[PDB]
Amino acid sequence: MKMKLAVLPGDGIGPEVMDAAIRVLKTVLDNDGHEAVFENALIGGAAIDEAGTPLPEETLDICRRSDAILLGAVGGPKWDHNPASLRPEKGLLGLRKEMGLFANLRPVKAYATLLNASPLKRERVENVDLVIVRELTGGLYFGRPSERRGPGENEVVDTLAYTREEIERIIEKAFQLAQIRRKKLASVDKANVLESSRMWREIAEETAKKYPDVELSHMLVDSTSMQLIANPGQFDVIVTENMFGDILSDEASVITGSLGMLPSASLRSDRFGMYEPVHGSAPDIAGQGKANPLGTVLSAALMLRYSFGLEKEAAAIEKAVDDVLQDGYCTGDLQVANGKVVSTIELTDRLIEKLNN
Amino acid sequence: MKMKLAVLPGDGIGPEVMDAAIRVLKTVLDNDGHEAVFENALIGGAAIDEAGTPLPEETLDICRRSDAILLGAVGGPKWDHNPASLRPEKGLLGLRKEMGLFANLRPVKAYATLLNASPLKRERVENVDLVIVRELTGGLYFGRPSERRGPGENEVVDTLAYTREEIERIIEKAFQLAQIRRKKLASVDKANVLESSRMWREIAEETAKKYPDVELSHMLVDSTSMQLIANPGQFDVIVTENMFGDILSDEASVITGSLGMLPSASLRSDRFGMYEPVHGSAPDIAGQGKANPLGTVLSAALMLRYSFGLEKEAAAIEKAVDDVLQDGYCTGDLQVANGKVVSTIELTDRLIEKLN
């Protein structure tokens, strides 16, 4: 019913696409009597310019108080001469850690008027409607030791380190997700070699008993690789570790041709999450009105669903987006069927129109 | 010239496909006085029966005295239910370990007749012609600690370990291969996070100096992932560590729609090498004259190219293969343009028939 959304526009096209999203968001909620509050906070270069830090204290306070957090994008050449800790990106990663977000969702859906842009033949990419869940916290990435020895640096090592809990929490959220979707989950691992994988597969099996309605299937990372190309239509929800997830996520991006309008979510154990578009800030297109708001809008859609259970409301936005693209409208970047180019503002106005239909 | 070759047909359709390779090989070699000395041996399940072990010491001696080793495939229902030590696969692993083969070279190229079947839109997959060189010896696959640490074993770890030499050799090999190809090497890693990758790139950069005529590029595994889909034609020779190469290899397998006629090869620091088709044993198919010999036949050509340097000879084989596929011929597994299914012996006959 009531919801306090933390809004963090950011840099570049960030604000543009955010306004577009908020508009769509507002209408949808209005149509069902929902009351929402939007507190705007700074992050990235903006925050740096106004508070010296890419992630000011006020912003954290707002986020902690909020039911969820909507983000645009951060980045720009103005801050590229600063040390890593004093750059846009840092504020983003910081915010993610402070909120304790471990799950990262990267949905990938096939849009009919976009199949011509798909690197694959229509027959395959057609029907693709999956979501990849990635472990953000642990993995081969943060695992120590990572060093050289020898002497003379003759030997080097990296460590894949996971705690039973880190694996439990993610596989749990994965199940809960597949449960509100087509109830099909694919635990991808390398259980044939990695011990961490063996632990993962065990826990997958265990958690399964708790969600008997969800079909658990086990796949080895390398097979999934081929399958994302020759049969991505089979996947509903895919759960996987950090390193493997990173890879698969990127692979799945290109398959539909919808890259550029891809949303994402970084969830945790409860109904809180940070939703933002995959695309960057693209400071070059700043102000010119070519900023593509579709990604951010679809993000707001994910928010409503995953953080508020507002399915009906979420589907509205998803349909609008689909229909408008079905009509051939885009801001210029997407290669929609029969090119009908409009501006950031218009494409938005269109989405709203379709909503009050 | 003369060339002693170990022939390990293996089991299943192994001996069927291995035949074709031998026939074709002879047809080609007898073009300019080439003494092809073949010496058959046992391995995998076959060996298990007539020797008790998946890898008979006799086979090793055979191998150790051969210029290169051709192989069919190993595996079967019969031996799959016995202990791990008496499983046919270990014979292969062992032999590879005994010969010290570290680099796994697995080529992927487009074949016009199969273009309709590719998962990628014609324009993308067309013209593809790359080779992925994967490191086999080290990495996260062979590295301890790899256990569940307490309390209550509620912690687990795996180790990615590499030695300066394991890396140096794989990269030098890669460079050398690029030099005989289009002179373009793509070193793939995760050098922004993995210290092993950081070291890998360093070494890759240093080796580049010794091969100034080869264009080196560094790509992150993940980018390389989407590139194999979006623009696979940009690659020539890709090189990377175990884990990464295992994945990428599999990814690139389907892109051209030729998985089933794809050959592989395991090499080491010298001209010696082991060549085998990527396909399994396929027991249920055994004897029915429907096994695809192309995969093994291509492996034979790779052998002539990488072990003996007989480029013109390898070229002829690959041409012959294309032409047969050009005429819409296969055994049923492939989906050629105007498809015509014939038997294994038949295709082979055509291959030879085209081979002259």
Side-chain angles (χ1 to χ4, degrees), chain A residues 1 3 5-56 59-64 66-96 98-171 173-205 207-208 211-357, chain B residues 1 3 5-25 27-30 33-34 36-56 59-64 66-79 81-84 88-89 91-205 207-208 211-270 272-309 313-356:
Chain A
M1 274 63 102
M3 56 185 87
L5 312 173
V7 167
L8 294 71
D11 313 293
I13 73 182
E16 281 162 86
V17 301
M18 189 70 246
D19 296 315
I22 304 174
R23 289 192 65 185
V24 180
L25 196 53
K26 272 202 172 74
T27 57
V28 181
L29 297 182
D30 161 69
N31 280 61
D32 287 282
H34 299 319
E35 193 163 61
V37 183
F38 309 87
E39 294 185 51
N40 286 58
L42 284 74
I43 198 166
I48 284 174
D49 294 340
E50 283 293 87
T53 170
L55 178 60
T59 307
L60 291 176
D61 284 345
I62 295 180
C63 292
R64 298 178 180 293
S66 302
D67 262 294
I69 159 185
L70 250 158
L71 184 83
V74 298
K78 184 175 178 294
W79 313 278
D80 276 26
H81 284 260
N82 299 10
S85 41
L86 297 179
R87 301 173 74 123
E89 303 73 30
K90 226 293 179 180
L92 179 40
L93 300 173
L95 186 52
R96 188 183 70 201
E98 208 90 25
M99 302 326 282
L101 310 167
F102 58 83
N104 179 103
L105 305 183
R106 172 77 117 263
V108 165
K109 183 174 172 56
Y111 283 132
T113 43
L114 280 169
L115 299 188
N116 59 295
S118 161
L120 323 173
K121 286 197 168 62
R122 175 176 57 77
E123 58 182 35
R124 303 173 174 293
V125 66
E126 188 174 52
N127 300 306
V128 167
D129 182 16
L130 52 76
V131 183
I132 295 182
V133 195
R134 169 185 178 215
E135 214 300 315
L136 295 173
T137 58
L140 180 73
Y141 291 173
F142 304 70
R144 200 116 73 197
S146 181
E147 68 215 29
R148 305 184 207 203
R149 299 137 166 186
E153 298 169 34
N154 292 314
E155 178 192 322
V156 51
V157 300
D158 282 280
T159 300
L160 173 36
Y162 265 112
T163 73
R164 196 166 191 287
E165 177 176 48
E166 292 172 338
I167 306 177
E168 285 187 290
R169 62 182 182 199
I170 188 178
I171 301 184
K173 207 66 192 293
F175 269 98
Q176 301 184 123
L177 298 182
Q179 197 167 66
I180 75 175
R181 305 195 70 242
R182 287 177 280 133
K183 297 174 182 294
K184 285 180 58 182
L185 178 48
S187 170
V188 185
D189 54 56
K190 194 55 176 167
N192 61 163
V193 172
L194 311 187
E195 186 68 39
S196 45
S197 280
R198 294 180 185 113
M199 183 180 269
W200 180 286
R201 189 161 291 184
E202 290 183 9
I203 306 170
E205 229 81 82
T207 314
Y211 304 86
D213 52 1
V214 180
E215 176 200 294
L216 175 56
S217 311
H218 286 278
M219 283 194 80
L220 291 188
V221 56
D222 48 345
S223 295
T224 312
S225 168
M226 309 174 111
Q227 296 302 105
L228 275 182
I229 285 179
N231 199 325
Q234 67 183 108
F235 309 97
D236 173 27
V237 183
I238 300 177
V239 68
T240 243
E241 77 145 27
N242 208 310
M243 155 72 80
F244 292 143
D246 193 8
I247 304 168
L248 299 181
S249 288
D250 286 17
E251 176 175 47
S253 299
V254 301
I255 69 172
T256 43
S258 60
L259 176 50
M261 63 170 288
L262 283 177
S264 66
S266 302
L267 316 181
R268 70 183 189 218
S269 315
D270 60 341
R271 271 175 48 206
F272 182 91
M274 186 177 72
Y275 303 72
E276 98 242 88
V278 174
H279 68 65
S281 56
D284 317 85
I285 298 313
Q288 298 184 62
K290 318 176 188 177
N292 188 338
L294 290 172
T296 316
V297 176
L298 292 158
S299 296
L302 295 168
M303 177 190 87
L304 289 185
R305 181 189 309 236
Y306 301 125
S307 295
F308 305 95
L310 294 175
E311 174 71 47
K312 179 180 174 296
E313 286 72 16
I317 299 190
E318 302 181 322
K319 178 178 171 290
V321 176
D322 181 48
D323 286 341
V324 185
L325 284 172
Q326 176 69 94
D327 281 30
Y329 294 93
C330 46
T331 350
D333 54 291
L334 296 186
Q335 287 306 288
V336 199
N338 300 251
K340 279 183 174 192
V341 173
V342 300
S343 75
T344 308
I345 310 86
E346 184 161 15
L347 185 50
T348 310
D349 279 341
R350 304 296 197 147
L351 298 165
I352 305 178
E353 198 161 288
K354 299 288 184 174
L355 297 175
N356 296 129
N357 198 125
Chain B
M1 74 174 272
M3 42 192 266
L5 317 173
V7 168
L8 289 60
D11 41 61
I13 65 184
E16 287 190 80
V17 309
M18 191 61 243
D19 178 29
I22 297 176
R23 299 180 58 199
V24 173
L25 253 184
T27 317
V28 189
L29 290 178
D30 297 332
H34 280 61
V37 183
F38 306 94
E39 185 149 80
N40 190 82
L42 264 75
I43 195 159
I48 289 173
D49 303 332
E50 292 66 46
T53 48
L55 173 55
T59 310
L60 288 185
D61 298 359
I62 304 292
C63 281
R64 290 189 250 248
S66 302
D67 298 25
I69 153 196
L70 287 179
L71 166 69
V74 300
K78 188 178 176 181
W79 318 282
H81 271 350
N82 69 36
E89 291 56 70
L92 169 55
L93 303 188
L95 179 49
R96 193 173 81 205
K97 178 191 182 69
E98 194 57 53
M99 303 318 271
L101 311 173
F102 59 87
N104 177 45
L105 179 160
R106 190 156 157 197
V108 183
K109 78 177 293 293
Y111 278 116
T113 343
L114 307 171
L115 287 176
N116 297 24
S118 159
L120 303 183
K121 279 170 159 62
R122 197 176 195 99
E123 326 95 53
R124 301 197 179 289
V125 63
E126 176 181 41
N127 272 324
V128 166
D129 177 25
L130 57 74
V131 175
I132 300 189
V133 184
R134 170 199 175 193
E135 210 298 320
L136 292 157
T137 80
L140 198 63
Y141 288 155
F142 309 115
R144 294 199 61 238
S146 205
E147 79 267 313
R148 313 190 187 204
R149 303 173 172 173
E153 297 188 319
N154 287 271
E155 176 183 314
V156 62
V157 305
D158 287 275
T159 301
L160 164 40
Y162 260 116
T163 67
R164 183 161 285 270
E165 190 198 3
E166 284 170 327
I167 298 173
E168 294 181 3
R169 60 176 177 188
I170 189 55
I171 299 184
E172 285 207 45
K173 193 70 177 186
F175 268 90
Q176 294 163 130
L177 286 171
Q179 193 172 52
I180 72 175
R181 302 196 73 220
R182 294 176 281 130
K183 310 178 190 303
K184 290 180 53 181
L185 171 58
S187 158
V188 175
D189 60 47
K190 197 58 185 166
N192 58 120
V193 176
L194 307 189
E195 182 67 51
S196 45
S197 285
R198 228 247 287 177
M199 180 178 245
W200 180 291
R201 198 177 299 225
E202 287 189 12
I203 303 174
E205 206 74 66
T207 309
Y211 305 83
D213 59 338
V214 166
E215 192 179 293
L216 171 62
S217 315
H218 303 276
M219 293 180 62
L220 296 183
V221 61
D222 54 329
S223 306
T224 318
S225 181
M226 50 168 77
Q227 290 312 109
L228 279 164
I229 300 181
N231 189 21
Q234 72 186 105
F235 302 116
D236 176 21
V237 169
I238 304 176
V239 70
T240 186
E241 66 104 271
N242 228 342
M243 182 57 104
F244 291 163
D246 191 23
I247 307 184
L248 300 186
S249 289
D250 272 12
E251 191 189 307
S253 303
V254 297
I255 73 168
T256 45
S258 52
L259 170 60
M261 68 167 280
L262 281 184
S264 67
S266 312
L267 307 168
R268 68 188 190 195
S269 311
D270 68 4
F272 175 76
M274 181 175 86
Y275 304 79
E276 100 219 65
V278 174
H279 69 80
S281 48
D284 37 30
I285 295 311
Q288 301 185 84
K290 58 170 70 172
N292 189 317
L294 301 175
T296 313
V297 179
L298 284 182
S299 302
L302 283 182
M303 188 199 78
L304 288 172
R305 180 186 308 292
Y306 301 133
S307 281
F308 306 99
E313 285 78 14
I317 299 179
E318 304 171 318
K319 180 51 186 164
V321 181
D322 178 41
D323 293 328
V324 182
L325 295 168
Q326 205 93 290
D327 297 352
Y329 279 125
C330 78
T331 43
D333 58 326
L334 286 179
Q335 311 306 313
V336 266
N338 292 271
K340 285 170 294 181
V341 171
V342 298
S343 55
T344 314
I345 295 74
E346 177 57 41
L347 269 188
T348 305
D349 295 336
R350 291 185 177 273
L351 278 161
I352 294 176
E353 188 176 62
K354 302 263 79 176
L355 206 56
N356 40 215

